[PDB]
Structure 1
Amino acid sequence: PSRLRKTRKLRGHVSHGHGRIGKHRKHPGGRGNAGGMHHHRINFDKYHPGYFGKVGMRHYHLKRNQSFCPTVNLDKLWTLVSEQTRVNAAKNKTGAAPIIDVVRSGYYKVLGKGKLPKQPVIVKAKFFSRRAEEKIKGVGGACVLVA
């Protein structure tokens, strides 16, 4: 609202909060990002290093869909299925292990970060990591690849 803005409190002060020595002129330093290498060089180098120059290869017809690969972590791994699944597996005595499919829930690669509760799991995914594999093996379980 215009009621609460600084302009209302600024009426009557000739200057309008912009100084008498240096006025409020149009474009004292140039428009936009001008002088990035000449008279704004200090600011550009101090606050945006690496701005100027080229690096890396050019990929012309990039399609993000080819590289689409969402990831999940082992601490979140048990949240894909319902709690009743996990508790039933926990108090089960036959040794049967529930099957968790991350592709069904929309994940492609499993990365092993969190601690895993001690019960067998059949994790089926598209890609695995070495540490996630070893975590699943240590907790007791199976890793299954799907396409």
Structure 2
Amino acid sequence: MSNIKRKKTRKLRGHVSHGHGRIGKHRKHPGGRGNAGGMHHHRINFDKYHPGYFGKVGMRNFHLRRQHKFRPEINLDKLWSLVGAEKFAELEKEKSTKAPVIDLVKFGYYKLLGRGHLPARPVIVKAKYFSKKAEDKIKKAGGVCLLSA
């Protein structure tokens, strides 16, 4: 880890003002502490760089317990990565006792998202919540979405 031997503050001895300019010397809190005055002196610096700083986009949601809404997402970009790699080539086979029934829910992703374009191979996806578009491309691949606990 650490060396103050790699610090340049070591090197700045002496250099009389240690990189903290002779005329205007670095003295404790020259611009007012923190985000102060953000309506005044730092107004340039806040809208630049943080702009939405300040007011409101109000819809106060008293007691959002983020278990109701949590809903993690898998894309239809990916979705075939739920299928173990040596079985992934095994169902490209061509052999049907089929179609591909992937349990999305036990892979922990509440919601199947739309993102588009999978191989023509039919996939049945067992998922709680649907992108209608994810289902639309799955139905074009000839599978289905079977809706799932």
Q: Normalised by the size of structure 1, how large is the TM-score?
A: 0.90
Q: Which residue of 1 aligns with 2:121?
A: 119
CA distance in 1, matches of 2:90, 2:6: 60
| Farther-moved stretch of structure 1 (109-118 vs 60-69) | 109-118
Q: Give CA deviations for 1:27-46 in whole Å, capped at 9, x if unaligned.
A: 11111211111112111122
Q: Which residue of 1 aligns with 2:104?
A: 102
- How many residue pairs end up in the alignment? 147
- In structure 2, relative to structure 1, the CA distance for the partners of 1:96 and 1:35 (3 Å cut) is same
Instruction: Provide structure 1 residue ranges, at least 5 long, that are not aligned to the other structure.
Output: none
- In structure 2, relative to structure 1, the CA distance for the partners of 1:87 and 1:18 (3 Å cut) is closer
Q: Which residue of 2 aligns with 1:27?
A: 29
Deviation of the 1:100 alpha carbon:
0.5
- In structure 2, relative to structure 1, the CA distance for the partners of 1:40 and 1:101 (3 Å cut) is same
Equivalent residues in 2 for 1:7-86, closer than 5 Å: 7-86=9-88
Answer yes or no: is the 8 Å Cα contact 1:89–1:97 preserved in 2: no
**Partner SS, residue 133 of structure 1:** helix
**Partner SS, residue 137 of structure 1:** helix
Letter in 1 for 2:119: P
Deviation of the 1:95 alpha carbon:
5.3
Aligned: 1:5 with 2:10: no
Deviation of the 1:13 alpha carbon:
1.4
Letter in 2 for 1:124: K
Q: CA RMSD in A?
A: 1.6
Answer yes or no: is the 8 Å Cα contact 1:100–1:124 preserved in 2: yes
Taking only the aligned residue pairs, the percentage that are identical comes to: 69
